[PDB]
PDB file of C-alpha atoms in Angstrom:
ATOM      1  CA  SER A  26       0.000   0.000   0.000  1.00 47.22           C
ATOM      2  CA  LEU A  27       2.992   2.436  -0.259  1.00 45.19           C
ATOM      3  CA  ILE A  28       2.578   5.523  -2.363  1.00 42.89           C
ATOM      4  CA  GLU A  29       5.030   8.261  -3.246  1.00 40.19           C
ATOM      5  CA  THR A  30       4.544  11.480  -1.292  1.00 40.83           C
ATOM      6  CA  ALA A  31       5.906  14.951  -1.946  1.00 37.03           C
ATOM      7  CA  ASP A  32       3.467  17.177  -0.001  1.00 37.42           C
ATOM      8  CA  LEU A  33       3.840  15.752   3.537  1.00 38.72           C
ATOM      9  CA  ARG A  34       6.150  17.483   5.982  1.00 36.18           C
ATOM     10  CA  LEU A  35       7.647  16.809   9.404  1.00 34.75           C
ATOM     11  CA  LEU A  36       8.485  19.974  11.362  1.00 31.06           C
ATOM     12  CA  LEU A  37      11.022  19.404  14.134  1.00 30.37           C
ATOM     13  CA  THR A  38      11.429  21.809  16.990  1.00 30.47           C
ATOM     14  CA  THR A  39      12.288  21.705  20.711  1.00 30.46           C
ATOM     15  CA  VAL A  40      10.963  23.356  23.859  1.00 29.46           C
ATOM     16  CA  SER A  41      12.345  23.234  27.377  1.00 29.72           C
ATOM     17  CA  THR A  42       9.431  21.723  29.344  1.00 32.01           C
ATOM     18  CA  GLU A  43       7.010  18.860  29.030  1.00 31.56           C
ATOM     19  CA  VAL A  44       4.143  21.175  29.919  1.00 30.75           C
ATOM     20  CA  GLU A  45       4.907  23.571  27.093  1.00 30.62           C
ATOM     21  CA  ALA A  46       5.299  20.682  24.633  1.00 32.02           C
ATOM     22  CA  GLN A  47       1.933  19.261  25.644  1.00 31.38           C
ATOM     23  CA  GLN A  48       0.198  22.631  25.366  1.00 34.27           C
ATOM     24  CA  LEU A  49       1.712  23.467  22.004  1.00 30.92           C
ATOM     25  CA  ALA A  50       0.865  20.066  20.606  1.00 31.35           C
ATOM     26  CA  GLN A  51      -2.737  20.213  21.732  1.00 31.71           C
ATOM     27  CA  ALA A  52      -3.325  23.742  20.457  1.00 32.79           C
ATOM     28  CA  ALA A  53      -1.610  23.114  17.085  1.00 30.66           C
ATOM     29  CA  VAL A  54      -3.806  20.103  16.443  1.00 28.13           C
ATOM     30  CA  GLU A  55      -6.928  21.994  17.607  1.00 28.01           C
ATOM     31  CA  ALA A  56      -5.993  24.850  15.224  1.00 29.50           C
ATOM     32  CA  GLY A  57      -5.752  22.417  12.296  1.00 26.42           C
ATOM     33  CA  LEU A  58      -2.091  23.297  11.747  1.00 26.16           C
ATOM     34  CA  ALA A  59      -0.836  19.746  12.319  1.00 26.98           C
ATOM     35  CA  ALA A  60      -2.552  16.357  12.186  1.00 26.81           C
ATOM     36  CA  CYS A  61      -0.382  14.694  14.854  1.00 27.25           C
ATOM     37  CA  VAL A  62       2.521  15.699  17.036  1.00 30.30           C
ATOM     38  CA  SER A  63       5.005  13.496  18.888  1.00 34.22           C
ATOM     39  CA  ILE A  64       6.922  14.561  21.985  1.00 33.31           C
ATOM     40  CA  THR A  65      10.174  12.861  22.998  1.00 32.50           C
ATOM     41  CA  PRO A  66      12.376  13.862  26.039  1.00 31.97           C
ATOM     42  CA  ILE A  67      15.935  14.593  24.995  1.00 30.53           C
ATOM     43  CA  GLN A  68      19.165  16.087  26.223  1.00 30.62           C
ATOM     44  CA  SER A  69      20.732  18.699  23.983  1.00 29.34           C
ATOM     45  CA  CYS A  70      24.316  19.881  23.890  1.00 27.43           C
ATOM     46  CA  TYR A  71      24.906  23.064  21.997  1.00 24.04           C
ATOM     47  CA  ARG A  72      26.875  26.153  21.334  1.00 22.93           C
ATOM     48  CA  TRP A  73      24.971  29.258  22.542  1.00 24.20           C
ATOM     49  CA  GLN A  74      26.480  32.738  22.892  1.00 22.51           C
ATOM     50  CA  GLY A  75      30.051  31.349  23.099  1.00 22.49           C
ATOM     51  CA  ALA A  76      29.441  28.667  25.763  1.00 24.26           C
ATOM     52  CA  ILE A  77      28.544  24.909  25.543  1.00 24.74           C
ATOM     53  CA  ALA A  78      25.479  23.806  27.536  1.00 24.56           C
ATOM     54  CA  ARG A  79      23.688  20.467  28.034  1.00 22.42           C
ATOM     55  CA  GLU A  80      20.027  20.861  28.889  1.00 21.52           C
ATOM     56  CA  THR A  81      16.937  18.731  28.975  1.00 22.00           C
ATOM     57  CA  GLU A  82      14.419  19.515  26.280  1.00 23.10           C
ATOM     58  CA  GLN A  83      11.390  18.021  24.546  1.00 28.31           C
ATOM     59  CA  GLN A  84      11.789  17.125  20.885  1.00 26.67           C
ATOM     60  CA  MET A  85       8.584  17.757  18.966  1.00 27.59           C
ATOM     61  CA  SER A  86       7.732  16.338  15.547  1.00 27.04           C
ATOM     62  CA  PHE A  87       4.678  17.874  13.863  1.00 29.56           C
ATOM     63  CA  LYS A  88       3.043  16.040  10.946  1.00 28.90           C
ATOM     64  CA  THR A  89       1.565  18.443   8.437  1.00 27.86           C
ATOM     65  CA  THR A  90       1.349  19.315   4.745  1.00 28.93           C
ATOM     66  CA  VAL A  91       3.344  21.739   2.659  1.00 29.61           C
ATOM     67  CA  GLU A  92       0.206  23.890   2.451  1.00 27.85           C
ATOM     68  CA  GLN A  93      -0.001  24.316   6.269  1.00 25.68           C
ATOM     69  CA  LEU A  94       3.710  24.331   7.000  1.00 25.31           C
ATOM     70  CA  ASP A  95       4.374  28.080   6.923  1.00 27.43           C
ATOM     71  CA  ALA A  96       1.364  28.848   9.067  1.00 24.37           C
ATOM     72  CA  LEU A  97       2.369  26.167  11.555  1.00 22.72           C
ATOM     73  CA  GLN A  98       5.921  27.365  11.795  1.00 24.72           C
ATOM     74  CA  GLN A  99       4.874  31.015  12.302  1.00 23.99           C
ATOM     75  CA  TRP A 100       2.241  30.093  14.859  1.00 23.45           C
ATOM     76  CA  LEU A 101       4.778  28.086  16.879  1.00 20.61           C
ATOM     77  CA  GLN A 102       7.148  31.058  16.895  1.00 18.75           C
ATOM     78  CA  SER A 103       4.305  33.257  18.185  1.00 17.81           C
ATOM     79  CA  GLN A 104       3.944  30.927  21.168  1.00 16.97           C
ATOM     80  CA  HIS A 105       7.557  31.493  22.459  1.00 17.57           C
ATOM     81  CA  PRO A 106       8.508  34.800  20.922  1.00 20.54           C
ATOM     82  CA  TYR A 107      11.665  35.193  23.071  1.00 20.64           C
ATOM     83  CA  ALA A 108      13.095  31.937  21.794  1.00 22.36           C
ATOM     84  CA  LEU A 109      15.180  31.226  18.606  1.00 25.00           C
ATOM     85  CA  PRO A 110      13.720  27.788  18.345  1.00 25.66           C
ATOM     86  CA  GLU A 111      15.000  24.779  16.463  1.00 25.98           C
ATOM     87  CA  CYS A 112      13.310  24.675  13.072  1.00 26.41           C
ATOM     88  CA  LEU A 113      14.060  21.770  10.783  1.00 26.30           C
ATOM     89  CA  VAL A 114      11.747  20.350   8.138  1.00 26.77           C
ATOM     90  CA  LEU A 115      11.901  16.875   6.648  1.00 27.19           C
ATOM     91  CA  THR A 116       9.991  15.549   3.639  1.00 27.21           C
ATOM     92  CA  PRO A 117       8.909  11.901   3.782  1.00 28.34           C
ATOM     93  CA  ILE A 118       9.250  10.183   0.403  1.00 26.47           C
ATOM     94  CA  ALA A 119       6.443   7.672   0.859  1.00 25.87           C
ATOM     95  CA  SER A 120       3.468   6.849   3.032  1.00 25.95           C
ATOM     96  CA  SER A 121       0.372   4.664   2.810  1.00 23.89           C
ATOM     97  CA  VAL A 122      -2.704   5.969   1.018  1.00 22.86           C
ATOM     98  CA  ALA A 123      -4.735   5.669   4.219  1.00 22.91           C
ATOM     99  CA  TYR A 124      -2.230   7.490   6.428  1.00 21.02           C
ATOM    100  CA  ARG A 125      -1.672  10.263   3.926  1.00 20.39           C
ATOM    101  CA  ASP A 126      -5.402  10.715   3.466  1.00 22.16           C
ATOM    102  CA  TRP A 127      -6.008  10.778   7.227  1.00 22.77           C
ATOM    103  CA  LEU A 128      -3.272  13.345   7.691  1.00 24.26           C
ATOM    104  CA  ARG A 129      -4.655  15.613   4.985  1.00 23.68           C
ATOM    105  CA  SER A 130      -8.229  15.165   6.388  1.00 22.45           C
ATOM    106  CA  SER A 131      -7.062  16.493   9.767  1.00 19.40           C
ATOM    107  CA  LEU A 132      -5.896  19.943   8.668  1.00 18.90           C
ATOM    108  CA  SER A 133      -7.917  23.173   8.479  1.00 19.15           C
TER     109      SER A 133
ATOM    110  CA  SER B  26      34.258   6.838   4.632  1.00 18.37           C
ATOM    111  CA  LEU B  27      31.179   8.922   4.000  1.00 13.36           C
ATOM    112  CA  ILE B  28      29.251   7.848   0.881  1.00 13.12           C
ATOM    113  CA  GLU B  29      26.250   9.234  -0.921  1.00 13.82           C
ATOM    114  CA  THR B  30      23.272   6.804  -0.691  1.00 16.82           C
ATOM    115  CA  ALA B  31      19.849   6.471  -2.360  1.00 17.28           C
ATOM    116  CA  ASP B  32      18.786   2.879  -1.590  1.00 15.20           C
ATOM    117  CA  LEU B  33      18.409   2.982   2.209  1.00 14.91           C
ATOM    118  CA  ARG B  34      15.044   3.644   3.865  1.00 16.41           C
ATOM    119  CA  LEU B  35      13.684   4.410   7.335  1.00 17.22           C
ATOM    120  CA  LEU B  36      10.089   3.347   7.876  1.00 14.90           C
ATOM    121  CA  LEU B  37       8.447   5.163  10.846  1.00 13.38           C
ATOM    122  CA  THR B  38       5.392   3.893  12.656  1.00 13.64           C
ATOM    123  CA  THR B  39       3.984   3.900  16.200  1.00 14.14           C
ATOM    124  CA  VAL B  40       2.368   1.312  18.437  1.00 16.10           C
ATOM    125  CA  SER B  41       0.753   1.698  21.851  1.00 17.15           C
ATOM    126  CA  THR B  42       2.909  -0.370  24.201  1.00 20.51           C
ATOM    127  CA  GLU B  43       6.539  -1.314  24.785  1.00 19.80           C
ATOM    128  CA  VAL B  44       5.588  -5.001  24.556  1.00 21.16           C
ATOM    129  CA  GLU B  45       3.918  -4.501  21.159  1.00 24.05           C
ATOM    130  CA  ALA B  46       6.958  -2.628  19.873  1.00 22.48           C
ATOM    131  CA  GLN B  47       9.435  -5.220  21.082  1.00 20.81           C
ATOM    132  CA  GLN B  48       7.489  -8.072  19.528  1.00 20.06           C
ATOM    133  CA  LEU B  49       6.984  -6.349  16.200  1.00 21.74           C
ATOM    134  CA  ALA B  50      10.647  -5.307  16.014  1.00 17.38           C
ATOM    135  CA  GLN B  51      11.895  -8.794  16.715  1.00 18.06           C
ATOM    136  CA  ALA B  52       9.574 -10.363  14.195  1.00 18.61           C
ATOM    137  CA  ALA B  53      10.581  -7.909  11.445  1.00 22.51           C
ATOM    138  CA  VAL B  54      14.269  -8.623  11.969  1.00 22.42           C
ATOM    139  CA  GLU B  55      13.617 -12.382  12.171  1.00 21.76           C
ATOM    140  CA  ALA B  56      11.803 -12.224   8.842  1.00 22.98           C
ATOM    141  CA  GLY B  57      14.739 -10.423   7.198  1.00 21.55           C
ATOM    142  CA  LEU B  58      12.577  -7.373   6.378  1.00 24.62           C
ATOM    143  CA  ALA B  59      14.457  -4.839   8.472  1.00 24.62           C
ATOM    144  CA  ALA B  60      18.142  -4.823   9.424  1.00 28.53           C
ATOM    145  CA  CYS B  61      17.433  -3.135  12.702  1.00 24.86           C
ATOM    146  CA  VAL B  62      14.627  -1.377  14.497  1.00 25.85           C
ATOM    147  CA  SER B  63      14.750   1.365  17.119  1.00 28.23           C
ATOM    148  CA  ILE B  64      12.069   1.910  19.707  1.00 31.90           C
ATOM    149  CA  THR B  65      11.587   5.262  21.473  1.00 33.83           C
ATOM    150  CA  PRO B  66       8.827   6.077  24.073  1.00 31.30           C
ATOM    151  CA  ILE B  67       6.771   9.136  23.048  1.00 27.45           C
ATOM    152  CA  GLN B  68       3.614  11.007  23.750  1.00 29.58           C
ATOM    153  CA  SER B  69       1.386  11.595  20.738  1.00 28.96           C
ATOM    154  CA  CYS B  70      -1.308  14.235  20.311  1.00 28.18           C
ATOM    155  CA  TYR B  71      -3.806  13.905  17.460  1.00 25.05           C
ATOM    156  CA  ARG B  72      -7.583  14.176  16.808  1.00 22.55           C
ATOM    157  CA  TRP B  73      -9.258  10.818  16.400  1.00 25.14           C
ATOM    158  CA  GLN B  74     -12.862   9.840  16.714  1.00 22.23           C
ATOM    159  CA  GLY B  75     -13.881  13.487  16.839  1.00 25.49           C
ATOM    160  CA  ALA B  76     -11.736  14.284  19.942  1.00 24.97           C
ATOM    161  CA  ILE B  77      -8.168  15.511  20.539  1.00 25.08           C
ATOM    162  CA  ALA B  78      -6.199  12.895  22.374  1.00 22.24           C
ATOM    163  CA  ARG B  79      -2.778  12.708  23.995  1.00 23.28           C
ATOM    164  CA  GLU B  80      -1.567   9.157  24.580  1.00 22.20           C
ATOM    165  CA  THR B  81       1.672   7.392  25.273  1.00 22.04           C
ATOM    166  CA  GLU B  82       3.064   5.402  22.348  1.00 21.81           C
ATOM    167  CA  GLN B  83       6.291   3.856  21.111  1.00 20.42           C
ATOM    168  CA  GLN B  84       7.930   5.359  18.033  1.00 19.87           C
ATOM    169  CA  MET B  85       9.472   2.693  15.838  1.00 18.37           C
ATOM    170  CA  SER B  86      12.097   3.262  13.110  1.00 17.77           C
ATOM    171  CA  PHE B  87      12.772   0.323  10.821  1.00 18.30           C
ATOM    172  CA  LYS B  88      16.006   0.399   8.813  1.00 20.69           C
ATOM    173  CA  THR B  89      15.709  -1.306   5.459  1.00 17.58           C
ATOM    174  CA  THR B  90      16.491  -1.045   1.759  1.00 18.49           C
ATOM    175  CA  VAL B  91      14.400   0.244  -1.104  1.00 13.58           C
ATOM    176  CA  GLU B  92      14.244  -3.370  -2.358  1.00 15.32           C
ATOM    177  CA  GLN B  93      12.730  -4.688   0.892  1.00 17.34           C
ATOM    178  CA  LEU B  94      10.513  -1.694   1.729  1.00 14.64           C
ATOM    179  CA  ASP B  95       7.308  -2.842   0.037  1.00 16.48           C
ATOM    180  CA  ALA B  96       7.541  -6.274   1.628  1.00 17.28           C
ATOM    181  CA  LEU B  97       8.202  -4.693   5.039  1.00 14.96           C
ATOM    182  CA  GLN B  98       5.166  -2.380   4.766  1.00 18.57           C
ATOM    183  CA  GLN B  99       2.889  -5.195   3.541  1.00 19.98           C
ATOM    184  CA  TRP B 100       4.031  -7.363   6.417  1.00 22.02           C
ATOM    185  CA  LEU B 101       3.748  -4.559   8.974  1.00 22.03           C
ATOM    186  CA  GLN B 102       0.138  -3.849   7.897  1.00 22.43           C
ATOM    187  CA  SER B 103      -0.834  -7.522   8.475  1.00 18.14           C
ATOM    188  CA  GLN B 104       0.886  -7.508  11.868  1.00 16.57           C
ATOM    189  CA  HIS B 105       0.329  -3.947  13.122  1.00 16.78           C
ATOM    190  CA  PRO B 106      -1.977  -3.518  16.158  1.00 18.26           C
ATOM    191  CA  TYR B 107      -3.630  -0.347  14.838  1.00 19.69           C
ATOM    192  CA  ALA B 108      -6.319  -0.220  12.227  1.00 17.72           C
ATOM    193  CA  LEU B 109      -4.674   2.913  10.759  1.00 18.08           C
ATOM    194  CA  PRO B 110      -0.911   2.676  11.406  1.00 21.80           C
ATOM    195  CA  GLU B 111       1.397   5.593  10.963  1.00 22.23           C
ATOM    196  CA  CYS B 112       3.465   5.058   7.819  1.00 24.18           C
ATOM    197  CA  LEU B 113       6.145   7.559   6.935  1.00 26.09           C
ATOM    198  CA  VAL B 114       9.259   6.754   4.945  1.00 24.46           C
ATOM    199  CA  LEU B 115      12.485   8.770   4.967  1.00 24.05           C
ATOM    200  CA  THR B 116      15.482   8.380   2.674  1.00 23.38           C
ATOM    201  CA  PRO B 117      18.912   8.982   4.186  1.00 28.94           C
ATOM    202  CA  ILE B 118      21.178  10.686   1.700  1.00 30.75           C
ATOM    203  CA  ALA B 119      24.510   9.506   3.051  1.00 28.34           C
ATOM    204  CA  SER B 120      25.954   6.781   5.234  1.00 28.34           C
ATOM    205  CA  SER B 121      29.327   5.181   5.820  1.00 29.92           C
ATOM    206  CA  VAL B 122      30.574   2.483   3.521  1.00 24.90           C
ATOM    207  CA  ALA B 123      30.688   0.026   6.415  1.00 28.32           C
ATOM    208  CA  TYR B 124      27.214   0.801   7.793  1.00 29.84           C
ATOM    209  CA  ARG B 125      25.520   0.732   4.406  1.00 30.34           C
ATOM    210  CA  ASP B 126      27.220  -2.572   3.689  1.00 34.03           C
ATOM    211  CA  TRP B 127      26.142  -3.989   7.058  1.00 36.44           C
ATOM    212  CA  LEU B 128      22.554  -2.949   6.554  1.00 38.16           C
ATOM    213  CA  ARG B 129      22.233  -4.325   3.050  1.00 39.67           C
ATOM    214  CA  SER B 130      24.109  -7.548   3.834  1.00 41.80           C
ATOM    215  CA  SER B 131      21.992  -8.267   6.922  1.00 44.30           C
ATOM    216  CA  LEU B 132      18.708  -8.591   5.000  1.00 39.58           C
TER     217      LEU B 132
ATOM    218  CA  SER C  25      11.765  33.620  11.469  1.00 42.82           C
ATOM    219  CA  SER C  26      10.353  32.818   7.976  1.00 42.59           C
ATOM    220  CA  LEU C  27      10.889  29.396   6.391  1.00 43.00           C
ATOM    221  CA  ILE C  28      13.501  29.181   3.736  1.00 49.52           C
ATOM    222  CA  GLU C  29      14.632  26.324   1.503  1.00 50.47           C
ATOM    223  CA  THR C  30      17.784  24.674   2.747  1.00 48.48           C
ATOM    224  CA  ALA C  31      20.167  22.270   1.029  1.00 48.57           C
ATOM    225  CA  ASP C  32      23.348  22.629   3.108  1.00 46.46           C
ATOM    226  CA  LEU C  33      22.170  21.458   6.583  1.00 46.48           C
ATOM    227  CA  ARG C  34      22.640  17.865   7.697  1.00 46.62           C
ATOM    228  CA  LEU C  35      21.521  15.590  10.537  1.00 45.67           C
ATOM    229  CA  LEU C  36      23.910  12.732  11.259  1.00 45.70           C
ATOM    230  CA  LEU C  37      22.301   9.894  13.218  1.00 46.44           C
ATOM    231  CA  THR C  38      24.288   7.368  15.200  1.00 50.32           C
ATOM    232  CA  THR C  39      23.910   5.344  18.424  1.00 50.75           C
ATOM    233  CA  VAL C  40      26.118   4.553  21.387  1.00 48.44           C
ATOM    234  CA  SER C  41      25.499   2.229  24.321  1.00 48.67           C
ATOM    235  CA  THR C  42      25.365   4.469  27.421  1.00 45.91           C
ATOM    236  CA  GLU C  43      24.208   7.903  28.479  1.00 43.56           C
ATOM    237  CA  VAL C  44      27.717   8.752  29.638  1.00 41.13           C
ATOM    238  CA  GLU C  45      29.187   7.788  26.286  1.00 36.13           C
ATOM    239  CA  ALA C  46      26.629   9.896  24.484  1.00 35.60           C
ATOM    240  CA  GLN C  47      27.126  12.946  26.700  1.00 37.07           C
ATOM    241  CA  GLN C  48      30.902  12.774  26.278  1.00 39.56           C
ATOM    242  CA  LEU C  49      30.798  12.310  22.511  1.00 35.99           C
ATOM    243  CA  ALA C  50      28.247  15.076  22.084  1.00 37.55           C
ATOM    244  CA  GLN C  51      30.275  17.518  24.155  1.00 36.12           C
ATOM    245  CA  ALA C  52      33.455  16.653  22.289  1.00 39.21           C
ATOM    246  CA  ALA C  53      31.868  17.154  18.852  1.00 41.62           C
ATOM    247  CA  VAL C  54      30.493  20.574  19.784  1.00 44.92           C
ATOM    248  CA  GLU C  55      33.824  21.544  21.367  1.00 42.66           C
ATOM    249  CA  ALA C  56      35.638  20.674  18.127  1.00 39.92           C
ATOM    250  CA  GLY C  57      33.271  22.729  15.982  1.00 43.80           C
ATOM    251  CA  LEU C  58      31.913  19.680  14.147  1.00 44.40           C
ATOM    252  CA  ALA C  59      28.256  20.061  15.182  1.00 49.36           C
ATOM    253  CA  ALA C  60      26.211  23.027  16.380  1.00 49.82           C
ATOM    254  CA  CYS C  61      23.878  20.918  18.500  1.00 54.46           C
ATOM    255  CA  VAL C  62      23.707  17.257  19.405  1.00 53.72           C
ATOM    256  CA  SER C  63      20.590  15.649  20.849  1.00 55.17           C
ATOM    257  CA  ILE C  64      20.509  12.400  22.785  1.00 55.41           C
ATOM    258  CA  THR C  65      17.457  10.125  23.246  1.00 54.87           C
ATOM    259  CA  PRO C  66      17.361   6.713  25.099  1.00 56.27           C
ATOM    260  CA  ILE C  67      16.177   3.929  22.781  1.00 54.40           C
ATOM    261  CA  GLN C  68      16.087   0.204  22.440  1.00 55.44           C
ATOM    262  CA  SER C  69      17.653  -1.298  19.290  1.00 52.18           C
ATOM    263  CA  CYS C  70      16.762  -4.698  17.861  1.00 53.67           C
ATOM    264  CA  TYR C  71      19.094  -6.351  15.332  1.00 53.18           C
ATOM    265  CA  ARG C  72      20.682  -9.753  14.636  1.00 53.23           C
ATOM    266  CA  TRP C  73      24.094 -10.275  16.215  1.00 53.65           C
ATOM    267  CA  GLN C  74      26.164 -13.521  15.815  1.00 52.72           C
ATOM    268  CA  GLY C  75      23.051 -15.097  14.303  1.00 48.43           C
ATOM    269  CA  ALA C  76      20.716 -14.331  17.248  1.00 46.71           C
ATOM    270  CA  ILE C  77      18.219 -11.527  17.677  1.00 44.94           C
ATOM    271  CA  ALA C  78      19.457  -8.955  20.201  1.00 46.25           C
ATOM    272  CA  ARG C  79      17.591  -6.099  21.844  1.00 43.25           C
ATOM    273  CA  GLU C  80      19.823  -3.632  23.686  1.00 44.02           C
ATOM    274  CA  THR C  81      19.493  -0.237  25.264  1.00 43.95           C
ATOM    275  CA  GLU C  82      21.249   2.496  23.348  1.00 46.83           C
ATOM    276  CA  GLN C  83      21.327   6.256  23.052  1.00 48.22           C
ATOM    277  CA  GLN C  84      20.224   7.709  19.733  1.00 47.05           C
ATOM    278  CA  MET C  85      22.287  10.741  18.789  1.00 50.50           C
ATOM    279  CA  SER C  86      21.431  13.416  16.242  1.00 50.84           C
ATOM    280  CA  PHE C  87      24.243  15.754  15.237  1.00 47.88           C
ATOM    281  CA  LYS C  88      23.163  19.029  13.584  1.00 51.76           C
ATOM    282  CA  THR C  89      25.836  20.215  11.167  1.00 55.08           C
ATOM    283  CA  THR C  90      26.482  21.572   7.716  1.00 54.07           C
ATOM    284  CA  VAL C  91      27.430  19.755   4.555  1.00 50.76           C
ATOM    285  CA  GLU C  92      30.814  21.483   4.786  1.00 49.86           C
ATOM    286  CA  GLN C  93      31.578  19.808   8.163  1.00 51.20           C
ATOM    287  CA  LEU C  94      29.874  16.485   7.450  1.00 52.49           C
ATOM    288  CA  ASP C  95      32.898  14.628   6.099  1.00 52.21           C
ATOM    289  CA  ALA C  96      35.120  15.894   8.982  1.00 50.01           C
ATOM    290  CA  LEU C  97      32.442  14.894  11.497  1.00 52.38           C
ATOM    291  CA  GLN C  98      32.199  11.352  10.058  1.00 51.97           C
ATOM    292  CA  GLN C  99      36.001  11.024   9.972  1.00 52.39           C
ATOM    293  CA  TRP C 100      36.225  12.213  13.577  1.00 50.16           C
ATOM    294  CA  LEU C 101      33.575   9.655  14.543  1.00 52.61           C
ATOM    295  CA  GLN C 102      35.784   6.949  12.933  1.00 53.87           C
ATOM    296  CA  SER C 103      38.284   7.661  15.748  1.00 54.50           C
ATOM    297  CA  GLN C 104      36.106   8.863  18.630  1.00 56.59           C
ATOM    298  CA  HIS C 105      32.922   6.778  18.486  1.00 53.29           C
ATOM    299  CA  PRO C 106      32.931   3.918  21.046  1.00 48.65           C
ATOM    300  CA  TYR C 107      31.764   1.289  18.498  1.00 52.85           C
ATOM    301  CA  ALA C 108      34.015  -0.210  15.808  1.00 52.58           C
ATOM    302  CA  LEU C 109      31.169  -0.078  13.247  1.00 54.95           C
ATOM    303  CA  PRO C 110      28.796   2.699  14.255  1.00 54.92           C
ATOM    304  CA  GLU C 111      25.386   3.481  12.795  1.00 54.22           C
ATOM    305  CA  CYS C 112      25.753   6.285  10.295  1.00 57.38           C
ATOM    306  CA  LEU C 113      22.679   7.669   8.594  1.00 57.21           C
ATOM    307  CA  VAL C 114      22.469  11.238   7.312  1.00 61.10           C
ATOM    308  CA  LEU C 115      19.292  13.220   6.631  1.00 59.68           C
ATOM    309  CA  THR C 116      18.956  16.530   4.778  1.00 59.64           C
ATOM    310  CA  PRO C 117      16.347  18.978   6.068  1.00 61.23           C
ATOM    311  CA  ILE C 118      14.579  20.675   3.186  1.00 63.80           C
ATOM    312  CA  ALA C 119      13.696  23.877   5.033  1.00 65.33           C
ATOM    313  CA  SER C 120      14.528  25.811   8.177  1.00 64.23           C
ATOM    314  CA  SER C 121      14.041  29.325   9.520  1.00 67.41           C
ATOM    315  CA  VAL C 122      16.479  32.014   8.515  1.00 70.68           C
ATOM    316  CA  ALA C 123      17.354  32.520  12.176  1.00 69.74           C
ATOM    317  CA  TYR C 124      17.996  28.848  12.939  1.00 70.61           C
ATOM    318  CA  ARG C 125      20.050  28.231   9.811  1.00 69.61           C
ATOM    319  CA  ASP C 126      22.117  31.339  10.528  1.00 68.36           C
ATOM    320  CA  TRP C 127      22.677  30.221  14.148  1.00 69.49           C
ATOM    321  CA  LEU C 128      23.742  26.758  13.040  1.00 71.11           C
ATOM    322  CA  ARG C 129      26.142  28.022  10.387  1.00 72.99           C
ATOM    323  CA  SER C 130      27.623  30.738  12.614  1.00 72.66           C
ATOM    324  CA  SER C 131      28.226  28.186  15.389  1.00 74.26           C
ATOM    325  CA  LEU C 132      30.649  26.344  13.125  1.00 72.47           C
TER     326      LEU C 132
END
């Protein structure tokens, strides 16, 4: 049942706290900006303003379409305006018809 | 030993429980359909059945080749606990010579 | 904050066995200028080893870098990774924000 896909997108970002991740995920789905969101606890080590830090974060992966992606990304920024958040987008190359159709059905 | 690659695939899906994930991963490797499978605990938020839900799940990532991918997905569908499984496929664009060779040879 | 097309960012994925190993390798890669950020996630990995199915705890690592540093990062992993034959899978994000891409590039 695999089909080629070019219009699905995964938006990856991080936030510091579980509570923020949960709230952002719920509201993005309610807004029709993403169909599904996963939240994974991580540790991140990074260069920021000269120094190296290791902090706990929540990795978020938002499932959306190319049509909703800009709106989603801008909306997420609006939710933590003080942050320069991680923003990486991946394009899946295939999916199932049913999963693709469900995902597209979930967006507004 | 970095090489450009086009024939490797990652198939992403989720299941509800650790037990389900462990069993499905083992069976896929046993069948020669995936070289290796990672399992990561997540929380997932989505609307289903008219209502927004947040539930704990296990993210699975199956490493395979383009040649085995259809067989893996057909198998996974027959064996997956969900009526509508997540199915997303990524293509890595580079690997190491040794890792690519391991993955392909293991199938 | 707007999304822009990106072709020169890379995510290198590998695993190690322990949290300590992952923290040390991540710190060392950032210190050497080979990655801007490294995330670490505990996982289980299932694979066949010596003819038998194994399932082991591991740490999934994701190194955020540029195409220009990718070869040097992989070469450095040849010497520094704890495993003789590490996982090595590289993804290319297709978009990012201007701010994030600029942060990542300026960190290296």
